[PDB]
Ligand binder design. Structure first.
Ligand SMILES: [Ba+2]
Ligand SMILES: [Ba+2]
Ligand SMILES: [K+]
Ligand SMILES: [K+]
Ligand SMILES: [K+]
Lengths: 93, 93, 93, 93
């Protein structure tokens, strides 16, 4: 519960930072910058967007290292503290 | 055993949702939509398909967060509860 | 030790299957098929190669689900049973 | 603490090796080679860069297998031994 809200907040802040950075420096629309930040930090990495500037590439290196741990922490406390009970909730007689 | 069948079902439902969504909104053939959903949720993310609409991008953000935990849960109970014994089965004298 | 050799073998067999499949059905050179199989199962997924046939897409879906667990098992017993001691070996006085 | 500095060093060496290799054999600028090495070993894999030579493809196969375990080890001791306390530090009254 309180574990999940902190990681939720931390993740949001991380995604806000990426959104602001890539819309400014890489010139993406904010929605595209948010989408790209998520696709990056979850390691999906389609490559429909990718940084074209050296500033963007360097930030991306750091962003990935700092953000992956946080995002996946959230993903798997979300799966553990929120979806795992819910699935059990519609199971037991 | 029963752990594996639930995750199997949960994963199928998730993949069905993606298939329906991306074939409708992004106009993919259903097979391509299924393939894309799998490539997305396993984080492989080739990028041969990727959402072109804002609706698609927003759904994809949410789809990734909800679905990755489930898919990898399945992958590694499949590896743990199904392939791990089977490999041992063809080992011991 | 014996844990590591089994996973080594299992991984090789998986990579051989992908190499044969993608060189035949998707028409890749065998080296490209091997490279693509690795890039796929480690989830790197550059997308310089990706299946163009429905046969290829369906196989890829199954290949990913069966193979990711195995490949990462190997990766992290390799890191745990082989590189972890070696790094310690050049540490202690 | 000392766990984190070793993994920091090991990761740097790995990234230096990739930078040197891909700038030489694949002809990338060193910054692009570093960026590509990171994007590769974190499995993000945009595909804006990817090896075009057989030498590059073979190295990449080996680089991925050796380096992923190390990089993610670092990522999650960084998240565990460095960011986890820091976040708690700005929490408690
Ligand atoms: Ba492309
Ligand atoms: Ba990827
Ligand atoms: K990945
Ligand atoms: K890609
Ligand atoms: K990718």
């Amino acid at each position: 519960d309180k574990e999940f809200q902190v990681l939720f907040v931390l993740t949001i802040l991380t995604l806000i930072s990426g959104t602001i950075f890539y819309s400014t420096v890489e010139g993406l629309r904010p929605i595209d910058a948010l989408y790209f930040s998520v696709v990056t930090l979850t390691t999906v990495g389609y490559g429909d967007f990718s940084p074209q500037t050296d500033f963007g590439k360097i930030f991306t290196i750091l962003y990935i290292f700092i953000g992956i741990g946080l995002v996946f922490g959230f993903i798997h406390k979300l799966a553990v503290n929120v979806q795992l009970p819910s699935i059990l909730s519609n199971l037991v007689p």
